[PDB]
């Protein structure tokens, strides 16, 4: 009758907490490939039989923009890269002189392996299983695991590659649709194959070519994908036409699409993919060209800007044989213009992205928490004294 | 040992009832690295759960609650912490929601529990 | 706000700062919220402003918490209010030519 | 932790005496797979023994016997369960024999223990 | 679980105070063989620490101290064991020094504790 304070132990209550996750992967460790060599000593085998518990009426706020797992993933990837793809020349400005590091320049096999992150003893990872959840808020379907699924540590810009697909629909996951200083990072519910090949055995040199590649995108898939994307953009901007453009300027890694295979760093001109304007869900941007292939002109470079903080690096010249990349476009790191001076139209551009954004699009489903079993509530009992 | 994880989403009242039911039934009797790396990790997780449990069971002695899961007090509710009724909080809230409602008063309450325990122990020894 | 005046085709260094020396993302915008210049990780990007052919930044200072907008070859039309978006805070400087 | 396995075959009375004697003495201070596969299995066996023990020690709270090995009650023997005397059962029977003699009444007894515990708790709270 | 090893060298009084402080803060929330051979040995060490702990917690029931870390008695100091005052021993001595001072009387004391526990239990049952 006095609502006596009663202490209850074993209460299923948790808080977000910071710990360091460990990695696991299905390392082979004998092909002398970078990811398998790294994984050999960096990671443990994956869990052959992980369990998952689905919680009942549980709602949890998942903020993908503040998920610290991202920073941990970032640090492991940098170590992998520094321990593998060694440039001939690495330039680090220091404030403001320049420090130059020179290293042997062997080429290495380089093909990503999925890596899983797992909770240490005493911790667990909450997973958001709501297929319609865009992030930054309440997830109404929460389950618990020790380990996340494996994620392929792909480094790229504009079009992100080989990620996961949405269960049913293309999902916009912007922190703020109307801010204009943040990305859209839309993920797809369908992967679109992009096939990039070198014109093998074409050896030609300029004088006082060799460094060339071509990327082929099905036009049909691209058309379907963009029609669906603009429909979602139209929902956000219901009285406006959607127009796509190329970048306004900036470093080559942003202006063109960037990716790598083996030791080769590719830059591709995506202009052919983004010059449309949908309004009545129709553009005729492609004249029903019947080519069925949107093709990009690509180049292979030796001197590139590093993604790993500010600095520049040079790699050895190209491999003499055939180079091929086969990737899944699984999302677009699109951005939007200011819009303040526009009248009835919104402009989108593919240029953009950095590595933290690429991981946010993969790690948004997971949060790490710990249970604090001691709780208090009032009740009707009294202790005899 | 946190078999109460599956209780998440239930109300505080419901959780209490579920444990009583389970207690009656239980009491009444009603490729090598993939195996050994994880073997160690699972044992570490279970040994740790036991150690934290035992630690807490003894830490609670400071409030006179040693060895117990549920312990009753001699400190009343102050109603500044929350002015809801017992049925409202036990029937329409989960443990997590409840904790959030009063998570800024926990140190106050913890302090009071320590203090009343000290005074009670003192009173008994003075009487003896 | 800070006000800086230049003349004709000369150059101006407008600045934004942070107490956190971690190359934290920032942007510069004009008074109409049109992106001018900003950072995406290690890379410099530009917006569709009249300054894309004039604007640059001292990349070497990004890890010092210094994120300037440097405009060369000023046009009289560039006189405006320039907005710094750094972390969460905003700062402003007016540019007069 | 079942160090009482070696007591099998002794009478209930004898088993009690043996434990008291041991308690005084203890308290008073008076080829790789063959190693690692079994290393894990032995740890699993020991961790489990601890977990079952702790579980039971808390489950017994429902009868007011939490934290105890031996707990006394407020429920009398009904003599329908068995009409033998205390000395007859404690001195001429082993625990297993005893359990068999009354293994069809255990649920009845368990129920009574729960009930008297509830009423006792109620009485104290009503008085307070 | 012997987190008190770091208390060595402190006085008995100081050790008690340190635990109370820690208790409040904790309770209030304020190359393969080199990995697997030792993984097993560390788990064995921790499982054993738990088992000895639980054993002792139940062995102490013989003195009426089951489940406790600190238990108070009904047996007075005889002063033949030691004639120092409480403050002298608690403030100017460490636990080890204290144990040495009286390590030849421990069996006497242990015996007395058993005896008074038996008589107390008897008295209650006779009264009931
Ligand atoms: C998305 O996922 C897909 C797969 O799921 C990734 O695609 C894989 O990309 C790797 C990139 O190399 C590609 O690997 C090549 O497969 C060939 C199949 O036979 C191999 O022959 C080839 O090995 C040679 O080239 C390597 C290039 O660095 C050398 O390191 C290696 O030693 C070999 O080199 C010898 O042969 C060449 C021949 O021209 C010769 O010039 C050399 O001197 C030397 O003699 C690679 O293993 C995979 O096959 C791709 N998978 C598929 C299905 O195509 C994709 O990259 C992911 N996307 C992103 C962005 O990462
Ligand atoms: C949360 O979403 C998951 C994912 O779909 C649901 O669980 C799965 O439901 C499918 C339906 O066919 C089953 O095949 C899976 O085996 C289920 N997975 C698990 C781990 O149970 C889950 O039920 C949803 N939970 C809530 C609360 O809605
Ligand atoms: C999401 O974007 C909108 C629009 O850019 C932000 O709204 C602006 O917020 C500032 C804050 O003082 C106001 O001064 C502006 O007038 C707002 N703009 C408009 C058009 O009203 C909104 O705050 C952003 N969300 C967050 C969390 O920052
Ligand atoms: C990408 O699509 C283009 C479509 O033109 C392919 O180019 C054609 O390749 C065939 C192969 O024999 C040639 O006969 C055609 O003349 C080519 N067309 C043109 C316009 O030159 C291109 O090869 C495709 N890319 C890849 C990697 O196959
Ligand atoms: C990229 O290369 C792959 C493999 O050569 C192509 O995959 C083939 O696509 C056709 C399309 O119907 C299928 O019928 C074949 O079975 C596919 N091959 C395999 C091995 O599955 C893929 O289409 C190419 N991508 C693009 C954009 O052209
Ligand atoms: C991508 O390729 C297009 C060509 O397909 C380049 O754009 C051309 O630039 C010249 C320069 O005067 C113009 O005359 C052409 O009309 C442009 N063509 C198109 C289709 O716009 C474009 O600059 C390249 N972009 C990148 C980033 O390399
Ligand atoms: C893509 O953005 C560019 C701006 O960088 C647009 O080009 C401008 O178009 C207007 C139209 O009158 C011209 O006055 C400007 O001088 C153009 N600027 C430049 C730098 O050329 C371009 O039209 C946009 N394209 C699409 C498809 O929206
Ligand atoms: C966007 O650019 C692409 C290429 O840069 C244009 O598509 C090609 O246009 C030529 C013109 O004769 C056609 O022959 C090709 O077949 C087209 N490609 C495909 C895959 O059909 C495209 O028209 C431009 N779109 C807009 C809206 O400007
Ligand atoms: C679109 O580009 C793809 C690029 O692979 C074309 O597929 C190739 O077509 C040539 C034609 O002889 C075949 O020899 C290749 O083996 C095909 N590649 C693959 C991986 O199968 C595709 O045909 C192009 N589409 C059209 C309509 O030309
Ligand atoms: C979906 O995105 C919008 C963007 O502002 C956000 O406000 C909303 O809360 C998101 N969904 C959930 C469940 O939070
Ligand atoms: C995309 O494909 C659909 C299929 O019917 C077609 O109607 C549409 O015009 C195509 N392209 C655009 C840009 O609208
Ligand atoms: C693209 O997604 C399909 C879906 O099954 C998968 O089979 C294919 O291997 C994926 N491609 C890449 C490069 O991962």
Swiss-Prot record, chain C:
Comment, domains: The Ig-like V-type domain mediates the interaction with MHCII.
Residue span, Ig-like V-type domain: 1-97
Function: Integral membrane glycoprotein that plays an essential role in the immune response and serves multiple functions in responses against both external and internal offenses. In T-cells, functions primarily as a coreceptor for MHC class II molecule:peptide complex. The antigens presented by class II peptides are derived from extracellular proteins while class I peptides are derived from cytosolic proteins. Interacts simultaneously with the T-cell receptor (TCR) and the MHC class II presented by antigen presenting cells (APCs).
Post-translational modification comment from the UniProt entry: Palmitoylation and association with LCK contribute to the enrichment of CD4 in lipid rafts.
Name of the protein described by the UniProt record: T-cell surface glycoprotein CD4
Subunit composition and interactions: Forms disulfide-linked homodimers at the cell surface. Interacts with LCK. Interacts with PTK2/FAK1. Binds to P4HB/PDI. Interacts with IL16; this interaction induces a CD4-dependent signaling in lymphocytes. Interacts (via Ig-like V-type domain) with MHCII alpha chain (via alpha-2 domain) and beta chain (via beta-2 domain); this interaction increases the affinity of TCR for peptide-MHCII. CD4 oligomerization via Ig-like C2-type 2 and 3 domains appears to be required for stable binding to MHCII and adhesion between T cells and APCs. Interacts with Aedes aegypti long form salivary protein D7L2. (Microbial infection) Interacts with HIV-1 Envelope polyprotein gp160 and protein Vpu.
Places the protein is found: Cell membrane
Organism the protein comes from: Homo sapiens
Disease: Immunodeficiency 79: An autosomal recessive disorder characterized by childhood onset of recurrent and recalcitrant skin warts due to uncontrolled viral infection with human papillomavirus (HPV). Some patients may also have recurrent respiratory infections. Laboratory studies show a complete absence of CD4+ T cells.
Disulphides: 16-84
Effect of residue 60 to R: Increases the affinity for MHCII
Highest taxon listed in the record's lineage: Eukaryota
Tissue specificity note: Highly expressed in T-helper cells. The presence of CD4 is a hallmark of T-helper cells which are specialized in the activation and growth of cytotoxic T-cells, regulation of B cells, or activation of phagocytes. CD4 is also present in other immune cells such as macrophages, dendritic cells or NK cells.
